[PDB]
Each structure stands twice: as structure tokens, then as C-alpha cells.
């Protein structure tokens, strides 16, 4: 099968053409199965299916990194590019606004913080 890394160092159109010829080959392999083929062809059906899956994977990755580059350093980005941990974590308070304190509390923690002490036994 095609190696994923050398699939990555190619351009969009070549992967598109490789995708197209793979589909021709898969269609040819399946009609051999219907009309009667050898075990090599029946086993080749699976490996060519996986190789199209590899090409779809690398194409989608290249598109998504391209989109992330386009939306890099922006306030709003597509919901697919946004993180998805849980709905609760997304709705929760961020650490910055959990650490926000009034100036009254800032003065209190400036002047009377939790001191470092000890007792002699």
C-alpha cells in the first residue's frame, strides 16, 4: 500500500488523481469478485479500500491544517476547529475570570497574606 508520509509530501491534485484511479481499480476488483476472481484479487479488495481511506485521511488533514492556518489568530473560528472537551467545560468559567478579584481583596492579599510560620517544640 501507499505510505502515509510520502502521501503527505504530495500536492492536492495528485492525491485527487490517485483517489480517482483507486476508485477505478476498486470498481474493477469488485466486478472481478462478482464475475469470479482469484484469492489474490479478493484480498486486494481490502488493501485497496484501506489505501483510498488513507488518501481520504491525508486529504482531510491537509485541508484542516490549511483551515487552521487561515483562521490562526482570530477571535472566532469554525466550530469544527474549536475544542470539544465537554459541553460543561465549554460553559464553565475560565481560570482568568475565576481568578478575578475586587481591588478590596487585592489589597487584603497584598498586605495580610497567608504567612509562613512555625513552632519551636
Amino acid at each position: 500500500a501507499l505510505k502515509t508520509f510520502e502521501l503527505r509530501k504530495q500536492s492536492q491534485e495528485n492525491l485527487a488523481e490517485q483517489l480517482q484511479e483507486l476508485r477505478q481499480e476498486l470498481a474493477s476488483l469488485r466486478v472481478q469478485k462478482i464475475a469470479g476472481g482469484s484469492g489474490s484479487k479478493l484480498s486486494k479488495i481490502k488493501t485497496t479500500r484501506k489505501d483510498i481511506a488513507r488518501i481520504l485521511t491525508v486529504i482531510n488533514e491537509s485541508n484542516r491544517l490549511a483551515a487552521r492556518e487561515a483562521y490562526k489568530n482570530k477571535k472566532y473560528i469554525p466550530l469544527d476547529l474549536r475544542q470539544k472537551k465537554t459541553r460543561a467545560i465549554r460553559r464553565a468559567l475560565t481560570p482568568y475570570e475565576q481568578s478575578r478579584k475586587t481591588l478590596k481583596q487585592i489589597k487584603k492579599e497584598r498586605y495580610f497574606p497567608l504567612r509562613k510560620y512555625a513552632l519551636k517544640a
Binding site: 475544542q83 472537551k85 465537554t86 467545560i89
Partner: protein, 75 residues
């Protein structure tokens, strides 16, 4: 003389419990937004509760949680 139907296949829950005239499923309560459930039917709850299906997303979340919900690509 028994050649009519009272219930049909439900869209939401896939059982032949969706009444035709009333147009409400006796099993899941569709088209009500809330799924029909009753605490006296403990066995009825456990036949349709979570875990009787694929739980495809919940298994995804659990494996994600076990690692602190990290994202990106390793070295």
C-alpha cells in the same frame, strides 16, 4: 375480521407501539419531547436505559477523560 392496525412502527424508538388515531407512541411517548418513563416500571426502564445501545460517544468521552482531555499531536 381482525385486519386493521391500532399501532405502527415508531419513528423514534423503532417499536410497533406508535398509535395511529392518538398519534402518540405508547412505549416512548413520541412526539413528546421527553422520553416516556415511569418509576413503577423499573424493568421497563432497564430495557431501554443507557447501555442497551452502542454508547459510541460516551465511550469516546470516557477514554478522553482518562487522559485529561488533551488535544493536539504527540512528538
Amino acid at each position: 375480521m381482525r385486519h386493521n392496525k391500532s399501532h405502527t412502527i415508531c419513528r423514534r424508538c423503532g417499536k410497533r407501539s406508535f398509535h395511529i388515531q392518538k398519534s402518540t407512541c405508547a412505549c416512548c411517548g413520541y412526539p413528546a419531547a421527553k422520553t416516556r418513563s415511569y418509576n413503577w416500571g423499573a424493568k421497563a426502564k432497564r430495557r431501554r436505559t443507557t447501555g442497551t445501545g452502542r454508547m459510541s460517544y460516551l465511550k469516546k468521552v470516557h477514554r478522553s477523560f482518562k487522559n485529561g482531555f488533551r488535544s493536539g499531536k504527540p512528538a
